[PDB]
Amino acid sequence: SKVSVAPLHLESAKEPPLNTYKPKEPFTATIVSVESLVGPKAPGETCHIVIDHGGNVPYWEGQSYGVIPPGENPKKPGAPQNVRLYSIASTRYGDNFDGRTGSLCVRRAVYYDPETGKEDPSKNGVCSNFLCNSKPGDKIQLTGPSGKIMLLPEEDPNATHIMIATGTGVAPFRGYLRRMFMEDVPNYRFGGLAWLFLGVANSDSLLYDEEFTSYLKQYPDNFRYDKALSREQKNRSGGKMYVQDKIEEYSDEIFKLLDGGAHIYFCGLKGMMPGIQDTLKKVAERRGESWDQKLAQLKKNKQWHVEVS
Ligand SMILES: Cc1cc2nc3c(=O)[nH]c(=O)nc-3n(C[C@H](O)[C@H](O)[C@H](O)COP(=O)(O)OP(=O)(O)OC[C@H]3O[C@@H](n4cnc5c(N)ncnc54)[C@H](O)[C@@H]3O)c2cc1C
Ligand SMILES: NC(=O)c1cccnc1
Ligand SMILES: [Mg+2]
């Protein structure tokens, strides 16, 4: 049932690759495909981009690629554009299971006048629209990979991993979950609990939902999946349902899991963190615990994984 992947020598590296390519001399990769991930009612367009790196820019799950969009740096004529980082949304084997491609999950940054709603493409995000406008055969300047915070701890193949995403923050977790459940990786046989929480605006904004729903069916004892749709659902207080509200609903079980050594991951919008922190603080304090001290301990034990912006 698990999908054969190749080449298995991608498992041989003892340390993660880092900054194999730098902005001074990027790797010229090639677009394989670009597809919209979302339906018509989604507030923004999010696309899935498959990139052929030919095996020259391997990575581990949870890392990022840098992309240098074309054109001159506007705040520095003569200079190339600044790198934009994107969380890799694929396993190290990639979506074609061959170790030649990696995938990105990209939200089109688009400017609307607050009063007249008029989109203004001159104020749109350069790299995100460059990427989602790409077509098979287009060239892309790649740097990296980079990142260590979101590397998956594999020392315990029965560990618990609590994955908290908003929007494109789901990207590393798509990679984690394929490695845990989809791909035939003989040296990593996951038998723990993986728990994905995903917050998006509405059902049309969900990302990779059919893939995650399939894991529920195939691995009911090892995978849990909870969604917060902020424009379509209300929390117990009658406000918009955010992922912090779903965390609160399970806060007893989550704290028990953390106390037992679970890893917790946060990826996506930085704006989700204050509300999430308040929720965990409330739960720690009811139990008689200092959240400041508990969080410090979680970080010391390497259980606390944050990459937001
Ligand atoms: C570690 C890391 C990982 C990341 N992972 C992802 C990911 O997986 N997916 C993802 O989508 N993003 C991710 N991001 C964000 C990504 O790096 C980019 O910052 C994002 O895509 C926007 O870059 P851009 O080049 O499209 O926009 P830019 O050209 O940099 O513009 C920035 C913003 O300014 C707005 N803007 C520009 N000019 C004006 C103006 N005159 N008036 C008003 N607004 C203006 C643009 O519309 C845009 O929203 C990540 C960031 C980090 C740090
Ligand atoms: N994938 C994301 O949306 C992301 C990850 C890290 C920082 N900012 C955004
Ligand atoms: Mg959909």
Omega before residue 7 within 30° of 0, cis: yes
Q: CATH classification of 147-308 is 1.20.1260.10, yes or no?
A: no
Q: Which of 5, 108, 91, 104 minimizes the C-alpha distance to 50?
A: 104
Cα 123-129-130 angle, rounded to 5 deg: 115
Q: Which ligand is nearest to the CA of 271?
A: 2
Cα-to-centroid distance, 39 and ligand 3 (Å):
5
Neighbouring CB atoms inside 10 A of 212's CB total 20
d(CA 235, CA 35) in angstroms, rounded, equals 32
Say how many Å lie between the first and final Cα of the chain, rounded.
37
CATH assignment of 8-146, among 1.10.3720.10, 2.40.30.10, 2.40.110.20, 3.40.50.1000: 2.40.30.10
Q: Which residues contact 209 (CB under 8 A, 6 or more apart)?
A: 227
Segments in the chain forming alpha helices (H)? 126-132, 171-177, 209-218, 243-249, 251-259, 272-286, 291-300
Q: Which residue carries 């041989």 as its tokens?
A: 12
Spacing, Cα 150 to ligand 2 middle (Å): 11
The residues spanned by each domain of the chain are: 8-146, 147-308
Question: For this experimental structure, what is the resolution in angstroms?
Answer: 1.9
Residue 205 near ligand 1, beta carbon < 6 Å: no
Q: Quote the Cα angle for 223-168-94, to 5°.
A: 70
Q: Cβ(86)–Cβ(130) under 8 Å?
A: no
Contact in structure between 36 and 45 (CB atoms under 8 Å): yes
* Residues linked to residue 21 through DSSP beta bridges, in sequence order: 144
Phi–psi pair at 257, nearest 5 degrees = -65, -45
Contact criterion met (CB below 8 Å) for 260 and 193: no
- Residue 142's H or E segment, with its range, is strand 139-146
Cis peptide bond upstream of 145, omega within 30: yes
d(CA 87, CA 103): 9
Strands of 27-36's sheet in order across: 84-87, 64-68, 139-146, 27-36, 46-52, 101-107
